[PDB]
């Protein structure tokens, strides 16, 4: 009778149709990804097309019930998710133009190549060629050549496309009554109509900026320590008061500073924990690795894996006859079918990755009873936050001793912990100014605050000011250096890596408290704590049926993103950095550059 009762019946029909159509698609996608054949690309495309067509038809249909006349909020959440027409609010001509632009930028990125200035037939792609240079080379000029020629050969191609992408995406977003495409992206965090849990799209800007201010002193000190270490190794290339040259950061963008570890390691003769040899000594295999991770989750009160998981997952490289896509992924196919795909090696890295991916599965199993559309993380940052904390616990010396991979005669001390925290900070803290700065620039481009003729000028001013990184070669507006990173040229939002990073330390802090952990937060292992498992499970089973602010509060007692646990985690390194830096300049002047003499 009423509009809500009809929407309920419509969703009732959608859920049952969607489950089966999504299941076929996932199944066809699975057979391609474990067995790369031309026939399988085809089945994968057809079943995905059916699923895409089903959604467009159901989206149109869902728009005939106005949310304005729906009071039940979970009905309202589902209808709204299905109603977001997205691109189909543009004219067909603009949609086709946009999808063509998207496609071209994507293939420019994945097929873009540079050839060395001596041999026009010997070329490198980004992956593996340029990435191997930017992660491994110590040679200043090789790194400079890779950095610059990536941005001038492929970035210049992306520039005109990116300009037209911004125009069309903004048209798309305004037609859906957002103020621009960045505001559209910030929609992931919006909560309306739940008293004491609402969250506006603009509020995300303020909380990212406020939490970032509190991160700056840790980052300034990390930056100053890293600059001093690099200056010792490159004395004629680095100013003691300047920004870090962008091509000296350990990958193609300085997205993570992970690969600076060999040049910056504090206590360079202390042994690093690597249980790989011990796994090989005890003849572990992939099966044992995943059995151990299962044991980890069972120890905190969470279910074991389903029988189908063990039967249907692909946990080792399937030999050489069939080729597989070996990037580790957790699959939620629907209908109680959960799988991990991973070409597992007998290494500590893959041992930790397995706990990470199985955390995804554990999240997927917990919200499987939610209606189809609410089967997801509470927001874009939750799934990855959940995966990360599992590797935190699994890697600690306590846990590695507990499972017999680390000798009890292993000696943890001051220095090995500072080593570990610095390696952690290079990756985790190093990416936070990078991530904030990149998204801020996109948010301002989408908002219209950066004219086209200052795109690159503003990009490099914000790199120098916010990130403390300076370009080694001047770039005019024929470049599009943002787009030389995957997420920009492939149309993915980036703030998720910032929010995820804060969430994970909030979770870990809460769970380690519930586990009664004594000592510095980075040493905590939540193993054997059913109190920790329950507190996590109370959020996991929510999916996205509740506001993310409430889902967060279930675990950590607060309703918002908070930096304090991240700083708490890094406090032992902070005080050590501050002491190390007593004879250094802390901070950076932005006018120095490698090419200005």
């Amino acid at each position: 009778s009423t509009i809500e009762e009809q929407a309920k019946t419509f969703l009732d029909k959608f859920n049952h149709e969607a489950e089966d159509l999504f299941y076929q698609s996932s199944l066809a996608s699975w057979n391609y990804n474990t067995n790369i054949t031309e026939e399988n690309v085809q089945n994968m495309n057809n079943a995905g097309d059916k699923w895409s067509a089903f959604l467009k038809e159901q989206s149109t249909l869902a728009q005939m019930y106005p949310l304005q006349e729906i009071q039940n909020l979970t009905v309202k959440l589902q209808l709204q998710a299905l109603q977001q027409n997205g691109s189909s609010v543009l004219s067909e001509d603009k949609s086709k133009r946009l999808n063509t632009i998207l496609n071209t930028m994507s293939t420019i990125y994945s097929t873009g190549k540079v050839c060395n200035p001596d041999n026009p037939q010997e070329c490198l792609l980004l992956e593996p060629g340029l990435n191997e240079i930017m992660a491994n080379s110590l040679d200043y000029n090789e790194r400079l050549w890779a950095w610059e020629s990536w941005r001038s050969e492929v970035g210049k191609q992306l520039r005109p496309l990116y300009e037209e992408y911004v125009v069309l995406k903004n048209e798309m977003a305004r037609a859906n009554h957002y103020e621009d495409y960045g505001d559209y992206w910030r929609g992931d965090y919006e909560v309306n109509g739940v008293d004491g849990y609402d969250y506006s799209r603009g509020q995300l800007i303020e909380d990212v900026e406020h939490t970032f201010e509190e991160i700056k002193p840790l980052y300034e000190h990390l930056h100053a320590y890293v600059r001093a270490k690099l200056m010792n190794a490159y004395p004629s290339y680095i100013s003691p008061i300047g920004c870090l040259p962008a091509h000296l950061l350990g990958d193609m963008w300085g997205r993570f500073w992970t690969n600076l570890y060999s040049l910056t390691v504090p206590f360079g003769q202390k042994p690093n924990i690597d249980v790989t040899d011990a796994m090989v000594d005890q003849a572990w295999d992939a099966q044992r690795i995943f059995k151990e991770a299962e044991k980890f989750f069972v120890s905190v009160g969470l279910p074991n894996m389903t029988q189908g998981f063990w039967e249907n997952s692909m946990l080792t490289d399937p030999g050489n006859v069939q080729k597989a896509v070996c990037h580790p992924t957790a699959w939620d196919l629907g209908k109680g079918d959960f799988r991990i795909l991973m070409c597992t090696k007998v290494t500590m890295d893959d041992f930790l990755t397995a706990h990470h991916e199985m955390g995804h599965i554990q999240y997927d199993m917990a919200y499987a009873a939610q209606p189809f559309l609410l089967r997801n993380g509470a927001n874009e940052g939750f799934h990855e936050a959940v995966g990360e904390i599992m590797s935190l616990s699994a890697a600690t010396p306590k846990h590695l001793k507990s499972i017999g991979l680390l000798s009890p005669d292993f000696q943890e001390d001051n220095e090995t912990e500072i080593n570990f925290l610095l390696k952690q900070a290079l990756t985790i803290v190093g990416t936070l100014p990078f991530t904030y700065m990149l998204e801020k620039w996109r948010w301002m481009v989408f908002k219209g605050e950066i004219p086209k003729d200052q795109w690159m000028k503003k990009w490099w001013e914000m790199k120098r000011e916010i990130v403390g990184v300076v370009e080694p070669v001047p770039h005019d507006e024929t470049y599009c250096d943002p787009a030389s990173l995957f997420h920009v040229s492939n149309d993915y939002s980036f703030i998720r890596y910032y929010t995820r990073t804060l969430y994970q330390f909030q979770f870990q802090e809460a769970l380690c408290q519930a586990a009664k952990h004594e000592g510095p937060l980075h040493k905590c292992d939540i193993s054997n704590s059913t109190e920790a498992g329950q507190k996590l499970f109370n959020m996991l089973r929510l999916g996205k049926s509740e506001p993310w602010t409430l889902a967060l509060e279930n675990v950590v007692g607060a309703k918002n993103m908070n930096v304090r646990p991240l700083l708490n985690y890094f406090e032992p390194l902070f005080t050590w950095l501050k002491d190390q830096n007593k004879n250094s300049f802390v901070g950076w002047s932005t006018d120095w550059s490698p090419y200005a003499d």
Partner: protein, 194 residues
């Protein structure tokens, strides 16, 4: 003194869809209810009213054996006082139910790669079923006010949806064969004993 034909109900090659649940009347025969219990091949065998061990020492005028296929997660609705799509729209047990409910996993027979769509269930109905009622209509369900004129459209859904049984589903989604035994007493002689 002939044996009750339970093998043809339990070992049928193909079961009914639950919306069109099959009923077999059992009469004038001798039934060994403790070979059924002591098979150790059923995941569910919950009698409501008297123990199997004890009802093998009993006589009834008529026994009914209803059989059908549902999802693993739905077997719990084959019990008195349950709600859900099966209990409300397909097969409804009364409150004072006195028979037995048997079920087992039939993933090996009732699912196949690419999907077995043979089995259907009723997704919508204007109201709930009375106990032991059966509805096999295929009338388009009018969810709105505009009539349907016998075709699917906005607010007009075909009322029967198919299960899609693939062998790789989870146990909650796998097919389960179900036999329900109803025992009745009347004024006529008791033609079923053990």
């Amino acid at each position: 003194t002939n044996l009750c034909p339970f093998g043809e109900v339990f070992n049928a090659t193909r079961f009914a869809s639950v919306y069109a649940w099959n009923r077999k009347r059992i009469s004038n025969c001798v039934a060994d209810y403790s070979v059924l219990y002591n098979s150790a091949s059923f995941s569910t065998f919950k009698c409501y009213g008297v123990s199997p061990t004890k009802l093998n020492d009993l006589c009834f005028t008529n026994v009914y054996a209803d059989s059908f296929v549902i999802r693993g997660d739905e077997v719990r609705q084959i019990a008195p006082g349950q709600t859900g799509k099966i209990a409300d729209y397909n097969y409804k047990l009364p409150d004072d139910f006195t028979g037995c409910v048997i079920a087992w996993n039939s993933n090996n027979l009732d699912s196949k790669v690419g999907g077995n769509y043979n089995y259907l269930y009723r997704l919508f109905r204007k109201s709930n079923l009375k106990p032991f009622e059966r509805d096999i209509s295929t009338e388009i369900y009018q969810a709105g006010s505009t009539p349907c004129n016998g075709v699917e459209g906005f607010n007009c859904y075909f009322p029967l949806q198919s299960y899609g049984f693939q062998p790789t589903n989870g146990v909650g989604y796998q097919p389960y064969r179900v036999v329900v035994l109803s025992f009745e007493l009347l004024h006529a002689p008791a033609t079923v004993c053990g």
